[PDB]
Design a protein around this ligand. Structure first.
Ligand SMILES: *[C@@H]1O[C@H](CO)[C@@H](O[C@@H]2O[C@H](CO)[C@@H](O[C@@H]3O[C@H](CO)[C@@H](O)[C@H](O)[C@H]3NC(C)=O)[C@H](O)[C@H]2NC(C)=O)[C@H](O)[C@H]1NC(C)=O
Ligand SMILES: *[C@@H]1O[C@H](CO)[C@@H](O)[C@H](O)[C@H]1NC(C)=O
Lengths: 157, 430, 49, 49
């Protein structure tokens, strides 16, 4: 005839178990994040303690003493990506991927800066050109300046 | 029709593939890997347990020496002692005063608990994994058979012949060296038989419980009894089995990776969800229905009605069934995006019947094969609220465009604008 | 499905919101704040007469 | 919240009504014997002292 620790208080958060917890005696709690990354935890708990567990997508398990092991689906709770705003609702996609979006966005921020400076050169060089053939003769009667319109001011001709 | 299928290793959920035999009616699968018990190849190297210094009763020669000999008992510690005056029930009894000799001897022996409460080392190799695969097949509706993983083993239990694995995910959660205790299994680098430092784990090291021989490095050091009294100072480290029960490490069923459970039973590691298994079945052709007997369902329509962007089968979709005959119609999404609760749907003459499913992409564009009739059940899904219960049926997470398509096409448009600015300089140039 | 709802303070009329739980059939509300009795914190300072 | 302060919440001492979020969960008695497993958080009045 043997031990048993009082049941936990399960509390939901986004991919996270808050657990206000309150034992009778020192209880060894422990878990197993079921990824091939185990990332287990152990701690004897005698003092009541609200704890936390970063649950992953595939699952975690939970062992309140010799009370049987629990298990938990924590998929999303940050609301995916509905859309009726410009971009502050994309946080939903960030809150589900706060590892790949930080780099995936900075990637998206990077390539536009790539596409910026390449557009700088392949505009300003090509804006420096098409006036060097034109603004060196300086009469230059061609009203097809209307292709750059960043290097400007013809001679009324 | 020997339906090869790569298949994710995950225990508690069916895998309702679809038999696309050209010529007769297709048949659904329902392959639920109810267990993944492993049973690697192992070797009992030595039991350990806490010692018992079961002292043999010392000699007391009253006037002169008694030389001791090194008896072959395990860790037979024996040391002659003089200079006693042993008070035994009548005051002393040996009439000399320095020639009073006392020979203490003590050897190590397995506890009585060693038989029953005992750690247990192992050299652990890989072995061969197993499963009680249920298939509630087709219209067969049942077989719950124990199988193997090695990719030529059938198991003709029921009517179907099925070949499994070998799995690609060779992570034996057991390490090479393992200690085992009752039910808590420890992937511990036990030192070895024959060596274990006293106090450290394996101070006692018996091959098995019966084995009278052992290795007892306990640092058992006898000291002389005090002030002319009969007793046996045995100075000894309490066992490395005493510790290892309260300064130990945690169990592999509480620290393993990739999702395993354990037993002191054939030394399996159940339900290790990791990787895929290339599974292939030879169905009984009798179980097939010929194609000309199931209703042809085409000229249909499918649409979600309340798609739940979730794990539990919250996704639903009516289907405007347009049948020819009336009867059953097995269903499946050949795309892994959608996992469906219903294997089979009954049909009247061109009615409509909703099914349940689950997805992972906001815009589930998954085909649905209603007994040789494909259809896209395109739509949009909603996130849930209530995520603290056991494991999913979805298991299909992948890459899941509202600011990417014309964004990056617009990102490109800047650099696409380049070489149509450049090389048009070549034209203005000529 | 814990149906949060901002809701006008007004007594004698229901507020028939709708539970949009994803997965099962929705259910209507009928929330009629039949009373708004207040009972502030007070102190008897002195009777007069 | 049970375990937290005010798991028991009675208006006064006389008040027969109260609020008891103690997470009191009965479990089945063991092996065919009469008793009452009550699995419960010791009070948030026990802690708080
Ligand atoms: C075969 O795959 C099935 C996948 O669900 C599972 O088989 C389940 O076995 C249970 C016990 O035999 C059945 O429960 C019984 O169902 C009947 C009919 O609904 C009820 O009258 C019984 O009360 C109920 N038993 C209990 C104790 O509640 C399940 O119905 C059955 N599953 C299905 C879909 O029918 C197992 O996963 C697997 N079988 C194995 C591994 O033996
Ligand atoms: C989560 O739990 C940890 C304990 O590891 C604590 O430090 C942290 O403050 C908690 N966060 C909450 C309750 O938001």
């Amino acid at each position: 005839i043997a031990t048993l620790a009082p049941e936990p208080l399960v509390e939901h958060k986004h991919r996270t178990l808050i657990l206000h917890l309150h034992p009778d005696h020192p209880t060894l709690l422990t878990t197993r994040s079921l990824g091939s990354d185990a990332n287990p935890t152990r701690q004897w708990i005698e003092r009541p303690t609200t704890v936390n567990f970063t649950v992953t997508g595939e699952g975690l398990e939970y062992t309140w003493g010799n009370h049987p092991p629990k298990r938990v689906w924590a998929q999303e709770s940050g609301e995916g990506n509905p859309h009726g705003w410009p971009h502050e609702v994309v946080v939903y996609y960030y809150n589900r991927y706060p590892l790949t979006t930080i780099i995936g966005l900075c990637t998206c921020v990077a390539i536009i800066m790539v596409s910026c400076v390449t557009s700088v050169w392949l505009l300003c060089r090509t804006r420096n050109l098409c006036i060097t053939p034109y603004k060196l003769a300086p009469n230059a009667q061609v009203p097809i300046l209307l292709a750059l319109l960043c290097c400007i001011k013809p001679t009324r001709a | 029709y020997e339906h090869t299928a790569v298949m994710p290793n995950k225990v508690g959920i069916p895998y309702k593939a679809l038999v696309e035999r050209p010529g007769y009616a297709p048949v659904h699968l329902q392959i639920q890997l109810v267990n993944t018990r492993i049973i690697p190849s192992t070797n009992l190297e030595y039991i350990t347990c806490k010692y018992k210094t079961k002292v043999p009763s010392p000699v007391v020669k009253c006037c002169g020496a008694t030389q001791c000999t090194s008896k072959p008992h395990p860790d037979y510690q024996c040391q002659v002692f003089t200079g006693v005056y042993p008070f035994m029930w009548g005051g002393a009894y040996c009439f000399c005063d320095t020639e009073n000799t006392q020979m203490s001897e003590a050897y190590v022996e397995r506890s009585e608990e060693c038989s029953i409460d005992h750690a247990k080392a192992y050299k652990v190799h890989t072995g061969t994994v197993q499963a009680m695969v249920n298939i509630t097949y087709g219209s067969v509706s049942w077989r719950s058979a124990d199988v193997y993983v090695n990719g030529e083993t059938p198991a003709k239990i029921g009517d179907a012949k099925l070949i499994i694995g070998p799995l690609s995910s060779a992570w034996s959660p057991f390490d090479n060296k393992v200690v085992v205790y009752g039910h808590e299994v420890y992937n511990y680098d036990f030192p070895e038989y024959g060596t274990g430092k006293a106090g450290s784990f394996g101070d006692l090291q018996s091959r098995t419980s019966t084995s009278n021989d052992l290795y007892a490095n306990t640092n058992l050091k006898l000291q002389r009894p005090q002030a002319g009294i009969v007793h046996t100072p045995f100075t000894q480290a309490p066992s490395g089995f005493e510790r290892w029960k309260r300064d130990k490490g945690a169990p592999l069923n509480d620290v393993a990776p990739f999702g395993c459970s354990i037993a002191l039973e054939p030394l399996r590691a159940e339900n290790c969800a990791v990787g895929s298994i290339p599974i292939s079945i030879d169905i009984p052709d009798a179980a097939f229905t010929r194609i000309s007997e199931t209703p042809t369902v085409s000229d249909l329509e499918c649409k979600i009605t309340e798609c739940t962007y979730a794990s539990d089968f919250g996704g639903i979709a009516t289907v405007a069934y347009k049948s020819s005959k009336a009867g059953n119609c097995p269903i499946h999404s050949p795309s892994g995006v959608a996992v469906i609760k219903e294997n089979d749907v009954t049909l009247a003459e061109s009615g409509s019947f909703t099914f349940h499913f689950s997805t992972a992409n906001i815009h589930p564009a998954f085909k649905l094969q209603v007994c040789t009739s494909a259809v896209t059940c395109k739509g949009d899904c909603k996130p849930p609220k209530d995520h603290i219960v056991d494991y999913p049926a979805q298991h299909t997470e992948s890459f899941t465009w509202s600011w990417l398509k014309v964004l990056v096409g617009g990102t490109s448009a800047f650099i696409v604008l380049g070489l149509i600015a450049t090389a048009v300089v070549a034209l203005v140039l000529f």
